[PDB]
Design a protein around this ligand. Structure first.
Ligand SMILES: CCCCCCCCCCCCCCCCCC(=O)OC[C@H](CO[C@@H]1O[C@H](CO[C@H]2O[C@H](CO)[C@H](O)[C@H](O)[C@H]2O)[C@H](O)[C@H](O)[C@H]1O)OC(=O)CCCCCCCCCCCCCCCCC
Ligand code: CLA
Ligand code: CLA
Ligand code: CLA
Ligand code: CLA
Ligand code: CLA
Ligand code: CLA
Ligand SMILES: CCCCCCCCCCCCCCCCCC(=O)OC[C@H](CO[C@@H]1O[C@H](CO)[C@H](O)[C@H](O)[C@H]1O)OC(=O)CCCCCCCCCCCCCCCCC
Ligand SMILES: CC1=C(/C=C/C(C)=C/C=C/C(C)=C/C=C/C=C(C)/C=C/C=C(C)/C=C/C2=C(C)CCCC2(C)C)C(C)(C)CCC1
Ligand SMILES: CCCCCCCCCCCCO[C@@H]1O[C@H](CO)[C@@H](O[C@H]2O[C@H](CO)[C@@H](O)[C@H](O)[C@H]2O)[C@H](O)[C@H]1O
Ligand SMILES: CCCCCCCCCCCCO[C@@H]1O[C@H](CO)[C@@H](O[C@H]2O[C@H](CO)[C@@H](O)[C@H](O)[C@H]2O)[C@H](O)[C@H]1O
Ligand SMILES: [Ca+2]
Ligand SMILES: [Ca+2]
Ligand SMILES: [Fe+2]
Lengths: 242, 450, 176, 32, 95, 30, 171, 60, 37, 114
């Protein structure tokens, strides 16, 4: 894609694909133990989706069921700017700063349940094990990210109830308008855990690519339901500014 | 030639049908009508000039003919600003004067000259059933039509050029030096799907392709004219077609309906042959300009336009198209195939580029987006611009709206005319256009359906 | 004024949802359809009763003979549409019956609206959307449209009620 | 303005012309 | 039950300009705030006390005097993510 | 189960159409 | 009038509103208007709001400044109606806003309180804006009543009375 | 410059007289001998008036 | 606006584009003169 | 040119100079790094008012170097159009050539500036 124009990739689903380190090398981005490295165009391409089914029993294992994405090639975070900060103890810290760092995704589970979730890396701070002097195959950033509500506080449900907008009651039923717990919308801030395992480094250009595994809650519909647990696996790419 | 119902069988409201086999008077009707067309061109152009305010943009003044002249590169300079009104005036006057010559010739042939040309000349006399001569007429006209296309080519290449809205350093008149002769591109255009993202021939987006197309069109039309003069219709065509004046009229009506629908779509969607600096923004452009305008405002107020999720969960300013391209958010997601010379600088290989959207915006781009957004081709029939719920103080209806609506309506009514004359030509060839014969009604000799 | 009355009945009565109006729409549209199809069928099954292309001159008001072929028309529509009129008397009665019956049915519905007896809602779908915020139909969307119309039109349409609706209480979607 | 007067005068001339031609051709037994 | 923004409206957020939650249009009322100073305030939020809206890096004399002249229009409440997430403090969808 | 009612009335309509076309009173010239 | 006569005699607000017969208060409830039903809202009006159990008493809403506010009542034409409260000289002092980004007259902002006189809630004051809004919506429908919605699995949409059904059928 | 407007006014008035005269001349078969040369004269004079206006525009 | 040498016939120019409508109406006028034969 | 007229020309002289600068700076670099996507975006956006400006300037110059600046301006636009073709056809060779000739003809335009 490095030499492809917009007119060559449009309508082809190559805009939603992560860039790939071509030069197959096992390089190493050397690091001073007390500095900061900017990450310019971070991309995470999700490839696998898993939703924790909630069995009706309370001692059965939940298990993770694969889903099919109902949305199309709109599942990728890209053009993300981050920093790699090095602790005095060789700890590498990934700190995603901004970018196209979220994508709403809807998966279908077997049995006909639609599970949308706010796929994101917002405010991700991942740390490796202390003792690194280079970014290599062993680097694995593990940390928490914020998962904001899938629907904003400006969202309106089909009966025009919302959080800072819309009705606060069931207007279609004047006598029973304050019966429905769904009259109160909330948008609680969720948390995800992401791991970035780096597998390929191109030290001649500062590029890093790897695989990720995310764990995050799904949409709750302004609190209308308990969120499911979603597992996302895929590949990522980044460039480190030296 | 009979000029009454008892002598022709045609009533006054079908009077021009009395000219079907009166080739001289029919020729007169045709030349006088051509005169009407040229008269309107000249007179309407002179009206537009007399009503033209040179500094005010063309699409704000109800102009549809001066934009056509300006696209050809006469009377305008960079960004379409008017340099001289005289070329528009000259175009109008030359059409207006020629109109009189055609009016005279028409009134002559319609009133004074021979009613039938068959006797007078073998060259101009035609019988509808004489396939060789009718193909001769097709050929002579195909050679003049191809000559006209080559006239467009000559104007774009050797006589000052044409307006290229995509020109580097801003839109301007450009002389085309490398027109696209590659038949793969040119005819590939014909093979593109007529849906979003491809747009068939409506998606032609560079003057080099337009000019190379007109070299092909001139060449194919001239070749087809020569072929039709030196050949006769073959057997399969002699067997599948109706050979009569009304039949040929219906064929041309079908063709005209097709071209009218095509022209409607062309003016609505394409901003290359119809530059927005003359025709105003396309509706796709106005929507994208709105999204862009508030992208810039909110970014300047300090918002993160990349990571700002909207109330639905999709990005408020930026999102991904179903194929992943970075596009503008909101309902404008539908117009993400829109290409415009003020937008394309901010597009990267993956779509809209965050680095460009955060550092390379220009005041002319912001001004252009504001102007295009406030000139969205939305307006009322009495020319109250903007959305229909707005109050009466903005006098504007886009030229694109006028042209598209007009040519869709004309295309539809000409499809209706095609059906009217094609069915009538078929019935009249078969001999039951005047009704069912009582003695030999076909259904009386057909078995019952049950 | 009539357009206002029409929109008022939409926004306050959900008159399009009323089956009586629907029967009226069916009657008026079917009346138009019957008019167009009878006219066209008759004009295109005409007997060749004259020499001119102007077929209108080929009819005498006192002639005893039908001016168009009912057999040909019947076969045409039987093979095009599957069924056809075969009795002209029933055809012309049907042309009266359809629009007239539609006007009567719509009038019955309007009489219901005089008392605010409206087919305004489907309670099943209102109860579900009340309980299930993921549930949306075109019906619920039209309900929302009606609430918007009512709130934005009442103060000016009913100036005697002195409806003071401050801007903040006016229902509206996002942005728009 | 005298313009509304001139526009209406030209328009009246043009409006009368065609009917005048038909009237002259009918009065003088022309080939109507 | 009240949702969180309605409960916020029961507090001082409903009376005065809230430095941690009020959108950029609420600063239009103070002369010389919209857009630049309101932008800088919204960018350096949250604030623990109103007084420390004067400790924003890079502020000049005019902006400091302008903030001090209007300290009594300002209140500080806990940042509610129902008014901040998605850059709602710059564009809540109100035109 | 209201879905069953809706499908049943729609099916009755369509079946009436089929019978009215396939088995109509044959128009005869008398 | 009956309340004001008792007030003129010397009674207190709670004593005067206690003179109001529940039957009289019941007639002053929009759910009993025959112009609130539906063509296919079948059956008894008890299948809608429910069986009326008791008058909850008369709400008096006051802002933080002590201005007496009245909820503007739902007219027969409206299926839904915005909640608006006006003071004595007809100036809107409170409402339940739809958009709260720019709201200015919210119950929460304006500190509306409601005190009840007579009925079941006699001598109670509600300051929690949730319950004040609930009672404001109740006041929209006129005098407020407790309902039993279980006996008939009442759905919460008003029906019309035998008056309405008779008129419909005979017209 | 007033001579230009004189020529243009003459063109507009001769144009009206010809708009009147052309259809009457072509549809009056009994007056054809008298009206053919008048038709030629009108056409030639009209073209000359157009050319004179053209040139004067280029002289003023 | 028209060039300055032509600003005289401006009211004539404003009424020129309509004339083909008058041609369509003149067809009917002539038919009425011939009695719609 | 009178200092007061020199001032009136500045309206146009400013964007022209900004353009001349970036052309020598980023454009050269873009062409060097063969970033054709960016070369195209640069000559259509940052330089997207170059014609309106250069010509406005030329028209506003004294009626002696006016046409010469006009002819010079048109020359640059011609080279920028060949830069665009070259970039669109990934032709690094002609791209460098057109860039150099555009700057030469841009240099001469600037020499015609009082
Ligand atoms: C004979 C064969 C008939 C049957 C054969 C196949 C059926 C085809 C029927 C048309 C189907 C079109 C459906 C979708 C139309 C559409 O997506 O859009 C219309 C398209 C145009 O495509 C658009 O083309 C555009 C091209 O512009 C692009 O390029 C431009 C270049 O300047 C600009 O830069 C612009 O910004 C940029 O986006 C975009 O790509 C749009 O996304 C794309 O949708 O029409 C076209 O391609 C071609 C124009 C077709 C005209 C059809 C409309 C009228 C149909 C007849 C009406 C009959 C009524 C009679 C009733 C009795
Ligand atoms: C584009 C419009 C158009 C044109 C070019 C024609 C042309 C023609 N028609 Mg048709 N017609 C039209 C519209 C048109 N018609 C419409 C709209 C109707 C319905 C009302 C008819 C109804 C109709 C009937 C019923 C008949 C015709 C016939 C004819 C033919 C003979 C005309 C004749 O003898 O009239 C004679 C009329 C006159 C002498 C009156 C004066 C007409 C002149 C041309 C006026 C010109 C004025 C103009 C301003 C002068 C400018 C001069 C200079 C500046 C150039 C002629 C070729 C006849 C035919 O078929 O012949 C066999 C016939 O019977 N037409
Ligand atoms: C392709 C044709 C076309 C198009 C797109 C336009 C477009 C425009 N013209 Mg132009 N014009 C045209 C033909 C056209 N005109 C013709 C033929 C004439 C000669 C009369 C004029 C004379 C003219 C003048 C004198 C003026 C314009 C003006 C305008 C502008 C405003 C239009 C307006 O307010 O309309 C109002 C809309 C209507 C009147 C609606 C007309 C509805 C038609 C009649 C319906 C017919 C449809 C269908 C074919 C009927 C067939 C029935 C049968 C087949 C069953 C707009 C840019 C104005 C302007 O801004 O100038 C700068 C102006 O002053 N035009
Ligand atoms: C489509 C248009 C058309 C057609 C096919 C004809 C055909 C005919 N006309 Mg007619 N005529 C026309 C337009 C047309 N005319 C016009 C506009 C006028 C007004 C000036 C006349 C005036 C006219 C008169 C007065 C007479 C004819 C006659 C004739 C016949 C013999 C022509 C001739 O001398 O041989 C061939 C002639 C030539 C080869 C030389 C002329 C070619 C032209 C003048 C030059 C090229 C045309 C143009 C300038 C270039 C392209 C046009 C542009 C729009 C692209 C023939 C049937 C005569 C007739 O009826 O005889 C019985 C006759 O007396 N015509
Ligand atoms: C206005 C221009 C014009 C007209 C009226 C004609 C008319 C004719 N041509 Mg000619 N032709 C033309 C231009 C024209 N030609 C040109 C420019 C060329 C050069 C390429 C030719 C080359 C040519 C050849 C080589 C032949 C003809 C033949 C014919 C005859 C029958 C053609 C036929 O049945 O078409 C109808 C078309 C078909 C039956 C083909 C089926 C195509 C299917 C239906 C797909 C159609 C596409 C779809 C429906 C439309 C999509 C819309 C979009 C593409 C615009 C007929 C007299 C034939 C003949 O008899 O020669 C004397 C013949 O063999 N023509
Ligand atoms: C170039 C195209 C073309 C040509 C040459 C013809 C030619 C012909 N047609 Mg066809 N027709 C066409 C297009 C064409 N038609 C279209 C597009 C339609 C669909 C609407 C029809 C529908 C049609 C029918 C239904 C019939 C014909 C008939 C005829 C014949 C007699 C026509 C006549 O005397 O009209 C006389 C002209 C008039 C009576 C004037 C019509 C006035 C209309 C209503 C005005 C249209 C609106 C106009 C733009 C003005 C709007 C402004 C308003 C504010 C005033 C003649 C052979 C007749 C036939 O079959 O004969 C064999 C016939 O019955 N045509
Ligand atoms: C004037 C007659 C009349 C009136 C005003 C009432 C009024 C009432 N009845 Mg009684 N009732 C009546 C006659 C009447 N009834 C008759 C004749 C019977 C015997 C069947 C009953 C049996 C009955 C029972 C068993 C019950 C009532 C109940 C009720 C109450 C609720 C009404 C309701 O939900 O309606 C609903 C009405 C409708 C939904 C209207 C239906 C409209 C039809 C379907 C339209 C169809 C028209 C046609 C198909 C379209 C024409 C097509 C065209 C081609 C011709 C109300 C007080 C209920 C109640 O509360 O009792 C205590 C109750 O349980 N009624
Ligand atoms: C064989 C002979 C008869 C066959 C019967 C077949 C008819 C079935 C069609 C249904 C008709 C009505 C049913 C509606 C739904 C339903 O079940 O209702 C059910 C309701 C009963 O409603 C029930 O009532 C209970 C209280 O006892 C509870 O409140 C329940 O909640 C409630 O459902 O039935 C009726 O009310 C029927 C009486 C109808 C009253 C007529 C009103 C005025 C008449 C106007 C007529 C208009 C004419 C149109 C012009 C043309
Ligand atoms: C450019 C020019 C010109 C030209 C012009 C012209 C060309 C003219 C024309 C003219 C015309 C072209 C006109 C006409 C008109 C028409 C009319 C005016 C008509 C009317 C109509 C009506 C009124 C109708 C009626 C009726 C009838 C008849 C039928 C039946 C029915 C009725 C009764 C209704 C001139 C010279 C000025 C000069 C300057 C320039
Ligand atoms: C040839 C004629 C026959 C037509 C073809 C038949 C194929 C159509 C399959 C539908 C038949 C019913 O089969 C099944 O129905 C249920 C009932 O809603 C659907 O179920 C769906 O809706 C229900 C409720 O709305 C949800 O709880 C469920 O999660 C969802 O998937 C299934 O998606 C469908 O697979
Ligand atoms: C594309 C070209 C199509 C050519 C098809 C016909 C070739 C012409 C040969 O000549 C034609 O032969 C056909 C056989 O199809 C005969 O039938 C005709 O009498 C004759 O006109
Ligand atoms: Ca606010
Ligand atoms: Ca004028
Ligand atoms: Fe009939």
């Amino acid at each position: 894609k490095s030499q492809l124009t917009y007119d060559d990739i449009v309508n082809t689903g190559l805009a939603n694909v992560c860039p790939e380190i071509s030069s197959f090398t096992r390089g190493t981005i050397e690091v001073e133990p007390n500095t900061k490295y900017f990450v310019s165009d971070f991309c995470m391409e999700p490839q696998e989706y898993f939703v924790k089914e909630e069995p009706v029993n309370k001692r059965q294992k939940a298990e993770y069921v694969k889903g099919k994405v109902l949305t199309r090639q709109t599942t990728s975070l890209e053009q993300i700017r981050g920093s790699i900060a090095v602790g005095a103890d060789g700890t590498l810290t990934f700190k995603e700063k901004d970018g196209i760092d979220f994508q709403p995704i809807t998966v279908l589970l077997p049995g006909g349940e639609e599970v949308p979730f706010f796929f994101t890396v917002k405010n991700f701070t991942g740390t490796t094990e202390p003792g690194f002097t280079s970014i290599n195959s062993s680097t694995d950033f593990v940390g928490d990210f914020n998962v904001p509500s899938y629907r904003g506080a400006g969202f309106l449900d089909p009966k025009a109830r919302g959080l800072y907008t819309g009705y606060d009651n069931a207007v279609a039923l004047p006598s029973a308008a304050d019966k429905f717990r769904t009259n109160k919308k909330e948008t609680p801030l969720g948390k995800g855990t992401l791991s970035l395992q780096v597998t390929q480094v191109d030290g001649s250009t500062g590029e890093i690519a790897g695989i990720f595994e995310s764990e995050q809650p799904s949409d709750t519909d302004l609190g209308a339901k308990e969120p499911l647990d979603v597992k996302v696996r895929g590949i990522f790419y980044g460039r480190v500014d030296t | 030639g009979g000029r009454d119902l008892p002598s022709t069988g045609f009533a006054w409201w079908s009077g021009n049908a009395r000219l079907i086999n009166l080739s001289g008077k029919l020729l007169g009707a045709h030349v006088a009508h051509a005169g009407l067309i040229v008269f309107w061109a000249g007179a309407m152009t002179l009206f537009e000039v007399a009503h033209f305010i040179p500094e005010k943009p063309m699409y704000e003044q109800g102009l549809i003919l001066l934009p056509h002249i300006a696209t050809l590169g006469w009377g305008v300079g960079p960004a379409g600003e008017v340099t001289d009104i005289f070329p528009f005036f000259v175009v109008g006057v030359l059409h207006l004067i020629s109109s009189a010559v055609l009016g005279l010739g028409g009134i002559y042939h319609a009133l004074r000259g021979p009613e039938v040309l068959e006797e007078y000349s073998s060259f101009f006399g035609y019988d509808w059933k004489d396939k060789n001569q009718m193909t001769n007429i097709i050929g002579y006209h195909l050679i003049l039509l191809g000559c006209g296309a080559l006239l467009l080519v000559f104007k774009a290449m050797f006589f000052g050029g044409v307006y290229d809205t995509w020109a580097p350093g801003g839109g301007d008149v450009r002389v085309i030096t490398n027109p696209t002769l590659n038949p793969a591109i040119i005819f590939g255009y014909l093979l593109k799907a007529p849906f979003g993202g491809e747009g068939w021939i409506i998606s032609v987006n560079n003057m080099e392709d337009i000019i190379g197309g007109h070299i092909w069109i001139g060449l194919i039309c001239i070749s087809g004219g020569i072929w039709h003069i030196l050949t006769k219709p073959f057997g399969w065509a002699r067997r599948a077609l109706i050979w009569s004046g009304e039949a040929y009229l219906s064929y041309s009506l079908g063709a005209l309906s097709l071209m009218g629908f095509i022209a409607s779509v062309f003016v609505w969607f394409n901003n290359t042959a119809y530059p927005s600096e003359f025709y105003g923004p396309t509706g796709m452009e106005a929507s994208q300009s709105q999204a862009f305008t508030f992208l810039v405002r909110d970014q300047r107020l300090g918002a993160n336009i990349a990571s700002a999720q909207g109330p639905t969960g999709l990005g408020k300013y930026l999102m991904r198209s179903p194929s992943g391209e970075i596009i503008f958010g909101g309902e404008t997601m539908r117009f993400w195939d829109f290409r415009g010379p003020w937008l394309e600088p901010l597009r990267g290989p993956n779509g809209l580029d965050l680095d460009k959207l955060r550092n390379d915006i220009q005041p002319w781009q912001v001004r252009r987006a504001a102007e295009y957004m406030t000139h969205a081709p939305l307006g009322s029939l009495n020319s109250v611009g903007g959305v229909i719920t707005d109050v009466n103080s903005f006098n504007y209806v886009s030229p694109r709206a006028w042209l598209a609506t007009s040519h869709f309506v004309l295309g539809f009514f000409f499809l209706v005319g095609h059906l009217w004359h094609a069915g009538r030509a078929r019935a009249a060839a078969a001999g039951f256009e005047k009704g069912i014969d009582r003695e030999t009604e076909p259904t009386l000799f057909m078995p019952d359906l049950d | 004024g009539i357009f206002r009355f029409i929109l008022f009945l939409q926004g306050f009565h959900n008159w399009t949802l009323n089956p009586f109006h629907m029967m009226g729409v069916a009657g008026i549209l079917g009346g138009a359809l019957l008019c167009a199809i009878h006219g066209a069928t008759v004009e295109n099954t005409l007997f060749e009763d004259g020499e001119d292309s102007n077929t209108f001159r080929a009819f005498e008001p006192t002639q005893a003979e039908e001016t168009y072929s009912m057999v040909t028309a019947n076969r045409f529509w039987s093979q095009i549409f599957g069924i056809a009129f075969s009795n002209k008397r029933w055809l012309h009665f049907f042309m009266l019956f359809v629009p007239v019956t539609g006007l009567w049915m719509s009038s019955v519905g309007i009489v219901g609206l005089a008392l605010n007896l409206r087919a305004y809602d489907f309670v099943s779908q209102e109860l579900r959307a009340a309980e299930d915020p993921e549930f949306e139909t075109f019906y619920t969307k039209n309900i929302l449209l009606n609430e918007g119309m009512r709130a934005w039109m009442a103060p000016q349409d009913q100036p005697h009620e002195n409806f003071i609706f401050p801007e903040e209480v006016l229902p509206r979607g996002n942005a728009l | 303005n005298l313009e509304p007067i001139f526009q209406l005068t030209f328009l009246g001339l043009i409006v009368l012309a065609g009917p005048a031609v038909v009237f002259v051709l009918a009065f003088r037994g022309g080939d109507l | 039950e009240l949702n969180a923004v309605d409960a916020k409206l029961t507090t001082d957020f409903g009376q005065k300009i809230d430095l941690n939650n009020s959108d950029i249009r609420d600063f239009r009322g103070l002369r010389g705030f919209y857009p630049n100073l309101a932008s800088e305030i919204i960018k350096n939020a949250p604030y623990d006390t109103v007084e420390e809206v004067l400790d924003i890096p890079g502020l000049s004399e005019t902006q400091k005097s302008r903030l001090e002249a209007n300290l009594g229009s300002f209140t500080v409440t806990e940042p509610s993510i129902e008014l901040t997430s998605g850059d709602d403090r710059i564009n809540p969808g109100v035109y | 189960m209201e879905s069953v009612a809706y499908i049943l009335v729609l099916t009755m309509a369509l079946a009436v159409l089929f019978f009215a076309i396939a088995f109509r009173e044959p128009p005869r010239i008398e | 009038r009956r309340v004001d006569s008792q007030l003129a005699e010397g009674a207190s607000l709670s004593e005067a509103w206690s003179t109001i017969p529940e039957k009289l208060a019941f007639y002053d409830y929009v759910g009993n208007s025959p112009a609130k039903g539906g063509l296919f809202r079948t059956g008894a009006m008890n299948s809608g709001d429910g069986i009326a159990q008791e008058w909850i008493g008369h709400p008096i809403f006051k802002d933080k400044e002590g201005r007496e506010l009245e909820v503007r009542r739902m007219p027969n034409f409206f299926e839904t109606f915005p909640v608006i409260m006006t003071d004595a000289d007809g100036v809107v002092r409170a409402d339940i806003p739809f958009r709260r980004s720019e709201s200015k007259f919210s119950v929460e902002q304006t500190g509306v309180t409601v005190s009840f006189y007579g009925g079941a809630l006699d001598g109670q004051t509600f300051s929690n804006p949730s319950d004040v809004k609930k009672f404001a919506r109740k006041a929209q429908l006129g005098e407020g009543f407790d309902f039993d919605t279980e006996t008939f699995n009442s759905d919460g949409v008003f029906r019309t009375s035998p008056r309405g059904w008779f008129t419909f059928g005979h017209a | 410059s007033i001579v230009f407007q004189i020529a243009l006014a003459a063109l507009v008035l001769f144009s009206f007289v010809m708009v009147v005269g052309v259809p009457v001349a072509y549809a009056s078969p009994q007056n054809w001998d008298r009206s053919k040369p008048l038709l030629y004269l009108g056409s030639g004079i009209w073209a000359i008036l157009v050319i004179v206006v053209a040139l004067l525009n280029f002289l003023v | 606006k028209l060039p300055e040498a032509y600003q005289i016939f401006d009211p004539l120019v404003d009424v020129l584009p309509v004339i083909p409508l008058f041609f369509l109406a003149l067809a009917f006028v002539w038919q009425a003169a011939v009695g719609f034969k | 040119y009178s200092p007061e007229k020199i001032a009136q020309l500045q309206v146009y002289v400013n964007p022209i100079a900004v353009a001349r600068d970036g052309m020598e700076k980023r454009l050269q670099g873009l062409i060097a790094d063969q970033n054709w996507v960016d070369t195209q975006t640069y000559i259509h956006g940052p330089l997207g008012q170059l014609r309106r400006d250069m010509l406005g300037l030329a028209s506003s110059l004294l009626p002696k170097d006016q046409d010469k600046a006009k002819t010079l301006a048109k020359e640059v636009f011609g080279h920028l159009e060949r830069l665009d073709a070259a970039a669109k056809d990934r032709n690094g060779s002609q791209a460098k050539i057109q860039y150099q000739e555009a700057l030469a003809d841009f240099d001469s335009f600037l020499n015609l500036l009082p």
